[PDB]
C-alpha cells in the first residue's frame, strides 16, 4: 500500500499531494518537510529507495521535480519506480511536453489523473492507452 504521493521541486515546494491515510495538517506539514530533507540530499551515486519513518520512499527526479511515492516496506521497489515513471508519461501526453508549470496552473486536474492511476493506497490503472482515452473523454465534459 501507498501511504502518500508527493511531487515537490528542488526547493521543496509541494505541487501535488495525494494522501492515502488520515493525517492532521500539522502532520501533513512536517511530513512534507521531511520528504524534502531526505530526497533532496541524495546524489544518484546513492539508490532510488530510502527508509522513511516506518515506511520507505520510492522516488525519481524529472527536471526540477521530485516524484516521491511512500510505501509499505515490504512493497515491490521496481514496480513502484516504474509506476512513478509511466505516470509522468501520461502527464506528458495529456499536457504535451509537460513541465513544472502545467502542473501548477492546472493543479486541480493533476488530481483527476492521479486518482485515475492510483486509488485508496493501491495501484489502479496501468494502461497508458486507456487512461489517455478517459482523460480525453472528460475535458469534453460540460
Amino acid at each position: 500500500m501507498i501511504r502518500f504521493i508527493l511531487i515537490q521541486n528542488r526547493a521543496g515546494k509541494t505541487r501535488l499531494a495525494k494522501w492515502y491515510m488520515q493525517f492532521d495538517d500539522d502532520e501533513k506539514q512536517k511530513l512534507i518537510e521531511e520528504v524534502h530533507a531526505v530526497v533532496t540530499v541524495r546524489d544518484a551515486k546513492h539508490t532510488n529507495f530510502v527508509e522513511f519513518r516506518n515506511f520507505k520512499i520510492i522516488y525519481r527526479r524529472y527536471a526540477g521535480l521530485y516524484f516521491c511515492i511512500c510505501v509499505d516496506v515490504n512493497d515491490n521497489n521496481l514496480a513502484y519506480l516504474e509506476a512513478i515513471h509511466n505516470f509522468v508519461e501520461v502527464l506528458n501526453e495529456y499536457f504535451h511536453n509537460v513541465c513544472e508549470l502545467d502542473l501548477v496552473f492546472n493543479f486541480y486536474k493533476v488530481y483527476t489523473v492521479v486518482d485515475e492511476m492510483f486509488l485508496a493506497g493501491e495501484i489502479r490503472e496501468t494502461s497508458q492507452t486507456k487512461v489517455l482515452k478517459q482523460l480525453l473523454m472528460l475535458q469534453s465534459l460540460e
Binding site: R10, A63, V88, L91, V98, C99, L101
Partner: peptide, 9 residues
C-alpha cells in the same frame, strides 16, 4: 529554477 524545462524527452 526554470520550472518550464520538460519533464521528459
Amino acid at each position: 529554477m526554470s520550472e518550464i524545462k520538460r519533464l521528459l524527452s
